[PDB]
Symmetry: C2
Subunit: 281 residues, 2 copies
């Protein structure tokens, strides 16, 4: 059941890692939790942060410096892992861009990935209800953000679940996975070769039909020196689709910033404030 395997006091709250037996994944999963000092006095809003390729549930906790801002605003931070671990699927670790550390936040339909690679259901349902049942977190004040594969994850999960996520932001998301190699490989393997099945997991397609209730729209930060800007991320495709659909998007482009956590750390404080304007309302 629910096991506390790591805990460190941090900005007058606690940075924890839990392990639990996931019924949706069918395997043990680890996730990180930051509780701010305010959680001692009642339930608090929470943000789910989704990490990118090769990352773990601890990458964000170590590298983003988000806990100070979570403590300042009274928001908990939940960090899922990026894939199932130790599923024993043949060659699930043969590449870093697919399989282990590379679940792409989809529910796989193709064998042999469909048995365990159910990260969409895991993050939006089982992990959420576990957090709500066992931690002092408000069910009605949840937001989501993430980086790259995780920024793809944050946009997709928010646009598909308006009943759950009240705010959404992203750092350097894979904005149009149907049209870059990382996404086309992931979708081909997990979902099959029928591109129509991929649209339900593509932020740029979802925004064309989404009905949203975001007070301050969708926040995206993108570094202009990002090595993946033209080869994988394609923010302009999402920006154009959201404009045609009338969806408010604040896409901020920053000259000279790269893809990684020196970039993410610079803007994560503004992201936590952005979410707090909705979640702490």
């Amino acid at each position: 059941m629910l096991e506390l395997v790591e805990e460190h006091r941090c900005f007058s709250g606690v940075q924890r890692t839990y392990k639990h037996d996931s019924q949706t994944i069918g395997l043990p999963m680890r996730f990180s939790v930051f509780l701010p000092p305010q959680a001692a006095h009642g339930k608090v809003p929470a943000l789910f942060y989704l990490a990118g390729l090769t990352c773990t549930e601890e990458t964000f906790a170590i590298k983003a410096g988000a806990q100070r801002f979570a403590s300042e605003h009274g928001i908990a931070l939940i960090g899922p892992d990026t894939s199932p671990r130790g599923a024993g699927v043949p060659n699930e670790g043969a590449a870093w861009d697919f399989g282990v550390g590379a679940g792409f936040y989809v529910d796989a339909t193709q064998e042999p990935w469909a048995r365990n690679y159910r990260m969409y259901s895991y993050v939006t349902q089982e992990l959420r209800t576990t957090v709500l049942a066992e931690l002092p977190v408000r069910e009605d004040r949840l937001g989501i953000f993430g980086h790259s594969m995780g920024g793809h994850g944050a946009l997709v999960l928010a646009l598909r679940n308006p009943d759950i996520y009240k705010s959404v932001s992203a750092f350097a998301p894979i904005a149009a996975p149907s049209h870059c190699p990382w996404g086309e490989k992931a979708f081909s393997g997990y979902l099959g070769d029928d591109r129509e099945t991929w649209k339900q997991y593509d932020a740029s397609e979802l925004v064309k039909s989404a009905k949203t209730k975001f007070d301050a729209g969708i926040l995206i930060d993108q570094g202009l020196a990002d090595n993946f800007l033209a080869t994988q991320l394609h923010p302009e495709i999402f920006e154009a689709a959201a404009k045609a659909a009338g969806q408010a998007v604040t896409l901020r482009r920053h000259e000279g910033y790269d893809h990684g956590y020196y970039f993410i750390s610079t803007f994560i404080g503004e992201h936590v404030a952005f979410h707090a304007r909705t979640l702490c309302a």
Copy 2:
């Protein structure tokens, strides 16, 4: 010569890593540099941060979240490595508490360490003058801080060089290395069996005879859940010695906090503010 090998924009400044051919070490060395935005219009004060056992030049840059505070106060951050790298001394990597990653910021006098393990002279002279010659840093506004072996280093280097280091603070320092296993092993190996020679690298011994005083005081943060508090750190010994010599020390003990960077990150903003009181005068 001076090679820029990493650079990422961060909090409107730059996080850099440099490689240079060290004459004092006799080998290439890597060091980290954070320049705040203010360094673009003039020289800025600088803080040297010394890392603990097993760390590298980038541990602080990645894990401490200090750049945000340095950018607010206009302080550069310089992070030396913890030891020579690739010196080829037999078995120098046999144990994690000695040799590689474990220079203890001393100048070794015993062979075979004496050839390259000159981290005291490296940090206080060669690295300092390289920084002052090649980067927009004020010679008269330098301070020093660090963690564990690096907290030992920060205290030792400040108390020995009051005309260099104008402010000093520490996270969980090895406060009396002559009286704990980490220090006894390192000093025995690097310095030999004459314990008198160890007193010049022992913060608790140095404070007993320090003539000059830091009138802004010495700031030390210690977590009470730290696993090394009673086995290696001994903050009480330095406290007792400082009290008896009239050196003001603010030793803050924090219930529940551990040894690592969730603890360090929590207080590093207060440390940069503390140093800025003197360095940004």
